[PDB]
């Protein structure tokens, strides 16, 4: 409409856990659908008013095809703590 | 690949693009240009790192490709499609295990002789056998033997596993046994390799959907079917019916005579000395599967190296200590098993 | 009807108005398998050298495919050994096929048959 | 922790023969050229039960220089399908990202389920496995990754894992002296 | 957690993480067997002719159970042989009560336990 649009996603593991087992439900089809609003529209036509968030629960439970690059290449690890990094908690 | 590189500069030469391309392996052609667009970034990253730190008016004028940052670009742009069947042909001669004229004629006389010889059939009184059952001590050589007749003349291969098809779930054991006989039947000859078929709810209907598709190749006699099992007790009787498996094939441990051409064949590519004797190594080696005799001689090799690092010859010495390390993993239970069965 | 476990099938079908008649097919004889023999063979381009009734008392514990499977395989062999324009078949190919051959009846089986006999059905 | 090879007494025989497929493919490469053999893959260690095989693998990590990583077989084992089949692959990548690394996968004896108690601990086995495989293969070329795995029973082993190219050295470790 | 048949039980449950320290009930044994007729012999009145020794030697393939049984019976029978008022256990009504009370283990079951005992599974 205006394009202001910061699209944040919650519940990343919740979206597809790997894919999950898709016997009658559409959550593989859903994702090739949306991957034309983002490696064509969410990327081709956005010069920078399109930047996906999600932030993931389980590191072992994500589907592996949404790690290929140019789509959600980096990653930024917080985890655990150090003794003087939970000092000023 | 070819046609992928046909603007990107490389350094790659026609032996460096044949093992890139056996190498990969489930890759359809559009991760092929994903991970063609990711080699061209991991080498501009790599000639940025380096000590040339200039700016880029001619950094980027070249940076060549070699094979070091395509083997980089696997680790994250990652296969599509291995699950998918597909076929090949398999490069195994009968020159490389051994030479084994009597199985070899007995295995012609299923594949070719129904459609080369159909005369001799017919003033002998027997029907044309159909797929062939081999039996024997566990090992790789079985597999070994079905790609070698795959390869001598024509007849593209394909291959189902045992165990696998059983413990999968319900749905998808039923269509992967139905798109491998369609798979074999548009590919004009075809040998259909089923492994260890004495793993055969889950007991039902997989055994039936593969009866009433075995019955549909009665007919056509370009399509073969090849199993191979351990055990030749708990194969159930619809299958071993005259009309669907005939001909059974014994593969024994080898022989005196195979043994030799195993050792003379890994001779020539190794410098032995003659100092030692053929003859004390064949009665010495016993019940040694053929994996094995291969596994003596890179022993007794790299143990010469260790003694001394500019070695030229192998002694006697590191044969008696190669054979000491290296020990036959069948028991010798199983031994008198298949002569008691023979 | 034709089944071949006998054990497993409810007694209310053989009552007197649903199944009467029970005939008992036996596993073949000496003399039975003599005459299965004989039939195997009148394709066959036998040499003169050949005694199937001496062949009969060495094939104990076969049934009909399995006899039916030995003449198969010493025809097969004496195709291989010979050559393709091969034109008889001697003695000494049918007694190592005996060796690849191996019989699929046993005593076990064969009991069963005789308990079922009487057991309850008589 | 680190422990050296003046700590562990004995087994200097056992660094020269482990030396053969870390050091010498990059620093010794015409000798195998001259015999005609390819350079080994990892190895296999066997021998009694016990905590010498681990200290053996770390002191190879602390010598030459390397980084070490370990996956443990009864834990993959008792862990989710799914997670289960990602979590060697990983592993591999982060093997990978670091350039010279040692992976030591322990007790690969658990990677074997008796066909009885199959209510899906049979296909836990085979998916694990079939991805093993093909991580081993992806490493054949690099040079510079080696798996050491050690075992109590050599037998049980699955036989693919023992083509020439995947894993090559067997290995006798003795009694502690 | 507690079963008597173990050979029905799952793999996956008997590993290292999940269930660990196996432990072995014994069936019992002759010095074992003279302690279990000592406890239920505490408060009954047992007369000087009764040893305890002799009926743990004739006794075989009791569970602890079947022993509780035999002093129970044997002092049923001192009431209705003896009346109503009596304080008398003999040993001929322990002999007496032996043939009313059968033991309830055999080789079959208990070669069933040593042999998973043995590896196989447990």
């Given at each position: 409409?205006?394009?202001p649009?910061?699209?944040?996603?919650?519940?990343?593991?919740?979206?597809?856990?790997?894919?999950?087992?898709?016997?009658?439900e559409?959550?593989?089809?859903?994702?090739?659908?949306?991957?034309?609003?983002?490696?064509?529209?969410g990327?081709?036509?956005?010069?920078?008013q399109?930047?996906?968030?999600?932030?993931?629960?389980?590191?072992?439970?994500?589907?592996?095809?949404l790690?290929?690059?140019?789509?959600?290449?980096?990653?930024?690890?917080?985890?655990?703590?150090?003794?003087?990094?939970?000092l000023?908690? | 690949?070819?046609?992928?590189?046909?603007?990107?500069?490389?350094l790659?030469?026609?032996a460096?693009?044949?093992?890139?391309?056996?190498s990969?392996?489930?890759?359809?052609g559009?991760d092929?240009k994903?991970?063609?667009?990711?080699?061209?970034?991991?080498?501009?990253?790599?000639?940025?790192?380096?000590?040339?730190?200039?700016?880029?008016?001619?950094?980027?004028?070249?940076?060549?490709?070699?094979?070091?940052?395509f083997?980089?670009?696997?680790?994250?742009?990652?296969?599509?499609?291995?699950?998918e069947?597909?076929?090949?042909?398999?490069?195994?001669?009968?020159?490389?295990?051994?030479?084994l004229?009597?199985?070899?004629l007995?295995?012609?006389?299923?594949?070719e002789?129904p459609?080369?010889?159909?005369?001799?059939?017919?003033?002998?009184?027997?029907?044309?056998?159909?797929g062939?059952?081999?039996?024997?001590?566990?090992?790789?050589?079985?597999?070994?033997?079905a790609?070698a007749?795959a390869?001598?003349?024509?007849?593209?291969?394909?291959?189902?596993?045992?165990?696998?098809?059983?413990?999968?779930?319900?749905?998808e054991?039923?269509?992967?046994?139905?798109?491998?006989?369609?798979?074999?039947?548009?590919?004009?000859?075809?040998?259909?390799?089923?492994?260890?078929?004495?793993?055969?709810?889950?007991?039902?209907?997989?055994?039936?959907?593969?009866?009433?598709?075995?019955?549909?190749?009665?007919?056509?006699?370009?399509?073969?079917?090849?199993?191979?099992?351990n055990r030749?007790?708990?194969?159930?009787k619809?299958l071993?019916?005259?009309?669907?498996?005939?001909?059974?094939?014994?593969?024994?441990?080898?022989?005196?005579?195979?043994?030799?051409?195993?050792?003379?064949?890994?001779?020539?590519?190794?410098?032995?000395?003659?100092?030692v004797?053929?003859?004390?190594?064949?009665?010495?080696?016993?019940?040694?599967?053929?994996?094995?005799i291969?596994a003596?001689?890179?022993?007794?090799?790299?143990?010469?190296?260790?003694?001394d690092?500019?070695?030229?010859?192998?002694?006697?010495?590191?044969?008696?200590?190669?054979?000491?390390?290296?020990?036959?993993?069948?028991?010798?239970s199983?031994?008198?098993?298949?002569?008691?069965y023979? | 009807?034709?089944?071949?476990?006998?054990?497993v099938?409810?007694?209310?079908?053989?009552?007197?108005?649903?199944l009467?008649?029970?005939?008992?097919?036996?596993?073949?004889?000496?003399?039975?398998?003599?005459?299965?023999?004989?039939?195997?063979?009148?394709?066959?381009?036998?040499?003169?050298?050949?005694?199937?009734?001496?062949?009969?008392?060495?094939?104990?514990?076969?049934?009909?495919?399995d006899?039916?499977?030995?003449?198969?395989?010493?025809?097969?062999?004496?195709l291989?050994?010979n050559g393709?324009?091969a034109?008889?078949?001697?003695?000494?190919?049918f007694?190592?096929?005996l060796?690849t051959?191996?019989?699929?009846?046993?005593?076990?089986?064969l009991?069963?048959?005789?308990?079922?006999?009487?057991?309850?059905?008589? | 922790?680190?422990?050296?090879?003046?700590?562990i007494?004995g087994l200097?025989?056992?660094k020269?023969?482990?030396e053969?497929?870390?050091?010498?493919?990059l620093?010794?490469?015409?000798?195998?050229?001259?015999?005609?053999?390819?350079?080994?893959?990892?190895?296999?260690?066997?021998?009694?039960?016990g905590?010498?095989?681990?200290?053996?693998?770390?002191?190879?990590?602390?010598?030459?220089?390397?980084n070490?990583?370990?996956?443990?077989?009864?834990?993959?084992?008792?862990?989710?399908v799914?997670?289960?089949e990602?979590?060697?692959?990983?592993?591999?990548?982060?093997?990978?990202?670091?350039?010279?690394?040692?992976?030591?996968?322990?007790?690969?004896?658990?990677?074997?389920?008796?066909?009885?108690?199959?209510?899906?601990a049979?296909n836990?086995?085979?998916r694990?496995?079939?991805?093993?495989?093909?991580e081993?293969?992806?490493?054949?070329?690099?040079?510079?990754?080696?798996?050491?795995?050690?075992?109590?029973?050599?037998d049980?082993?699955?036989?693919?894992l023992?083509?020439?190219?995947?894993?090559?050295?067997?290995?006798?470790?003795?009694?502690?002296?």
């Amino acid at each position: 409409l205006r394009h202001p649009s910061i699209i944040f996603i919650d519940q990343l593991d919740a979206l597809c856990p790997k894919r999950e087992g898709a016997q009658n439900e559409v959550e593989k089809r859903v994702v090739a659908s949306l991957l034309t609003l983002m490696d064509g529209i969410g990327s081709e036509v956005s010069e920078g008013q399109v930047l996906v968030l999600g932030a993931t629960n389980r590191p072992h439970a994500l589907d592996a095809a949404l790690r290929r690059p140019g789509r959600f290449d980096k990653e930024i690890e917080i985890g655990v703590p150090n003794a003087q990094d939970r000092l000023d908690i | 690949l070819q046609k992928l590189l046909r603007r990107v500069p490389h350094l790659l030469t026609e032996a460096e693009l044949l093992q890139l391309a056996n190498s990969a392996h489930g890759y359809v052609g559009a991760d092929l240009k994903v991970l063609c667009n990711e080699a061209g970034l991991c080498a501009l990253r790599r000639i940025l790192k380096k000590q040339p730190n200039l700016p880029d008016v001619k950094v980027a004028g070249l940076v060549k490709i070699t094979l070091k940052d395509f083997l980089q670009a696997m680790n994250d742009i990652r296969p599509s499609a291995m699950r998918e069947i597909a076929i090949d042909v398999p490069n195994v001669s009968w020159s490389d295990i051994g030479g084994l004229e009597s199985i070899k004629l007995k295995l012609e006389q299923a594949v070719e002789w129904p459609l080369k010889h159909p005369e001799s059939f017919i003033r002998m009184g027997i029907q044309p056998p159909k797929g062939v059952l081999l039996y024997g001590p566990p090992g790789c050589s079985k597999t070994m033997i079905a790609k070698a007749l795959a390869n001598e003349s024509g007849l593209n291969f394909l291959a189902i596993k045992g165990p696998e098809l059983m413990n999968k779930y319900v749905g998808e054991s039923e269509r992967a046994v139905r798109e491998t006989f369609r798979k074999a039947r548009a590919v004009a000859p075809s040998i259909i390799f089923f492994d260890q078929l004495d793993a055969l709810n889950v007991a039902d209907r997989v055994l039936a959907q593969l009866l009433t598709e075995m019955d549909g190749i009665e007919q056509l006699k370009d399509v073969t079917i090849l199993a191979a099992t351990n055990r030749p007790d708990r194969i159930d009787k619809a299958l071993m019916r005259p009309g669907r498996i005939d001909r059974i094939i014994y593969v024994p441990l080898p022989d005196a005579a195979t043994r030799r051409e195993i050792f003379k064949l890994q001779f020539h590519s190794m410098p032995v000395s003659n100092e030692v004797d053929l003859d004390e190594l064949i009665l010495q080696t016993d019940a040694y599967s053929g994996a094995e005799i291969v596994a003596v001689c890179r022993e007794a090799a790299l143990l010469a190296l260790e003694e001394d690092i500019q070695a030229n010859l192998i002694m006697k010495r590191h044969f008696t200590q190669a054979l000491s390390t290296v020990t036959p993993r069948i028991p010798e239970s199983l031994r008198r098993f298949y002569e008691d069965y023979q | 009807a034709a089944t071949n476990r006998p054990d497993v099938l409810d007694t209310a079908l053989l009552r007197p108005g649903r199944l009467d008649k029970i005939i008992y097919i036996p596993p073949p004889d000496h003399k039975g398998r003599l005459s299965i023999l004989k039939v195997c063979t009148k394709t066959m381009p036998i040499g003169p050298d050949v005694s199937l009734e001496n062949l009969a008392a060495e094939t104990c514990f076969f049934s009909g495919a399995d006899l039916r499977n030995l003449c198969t395989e010493a025809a097969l062999l004496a195709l291989q050994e010979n050559g393709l324009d091969a034109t008889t078949v001697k003695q000494e190919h049918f007694l190592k096929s005996l060796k690849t051959v191996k019989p699929s009846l046993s005593c076990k089986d064969l009991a069963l048959y005789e308990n079922l006999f009487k057991k309850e059905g008589f | 922790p680190n422990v050296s090879w003046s700590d562990i007494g004995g087994l200097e025989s056992i660094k020269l023969k482990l030396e053969q497929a870390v050091e010498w493919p990059l620093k010794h490469p015409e000798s195998f050229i001259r015999m005609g053999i390819q350079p080994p893959k990892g190895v296999l260690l066997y021998g009694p039960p016990g905590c010498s095989k681990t200290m053996i693998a770390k002191a190879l990590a602390n010598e030459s220089g390397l980084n070490f990583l370990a996956i443990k077989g009864p834990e993959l084992m008792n862990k989710y399908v799914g997670e289960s089949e990602r979590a060697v692959r990983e592993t591999f990548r982060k093997a990978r990202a670091v350039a010279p690394s040692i992976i030591f996968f322990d007790q690969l004896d658990a990677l074997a389920v008796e066909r009885g108690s199959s209510l899906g601990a049979g296909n836990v086995a085979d998916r694990v496995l079939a991805q093993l495989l093909t991580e081993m293969d992806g490493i054949e070329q690099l040079k510079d990754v080696t798996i050491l795995a050690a075992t109590n029973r050599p037998d049980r082993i699955d036989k693919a894992l023992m083509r020439p190219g995947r894993i090559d050295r067997i290995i006798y470790v003795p009694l502690p002296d």
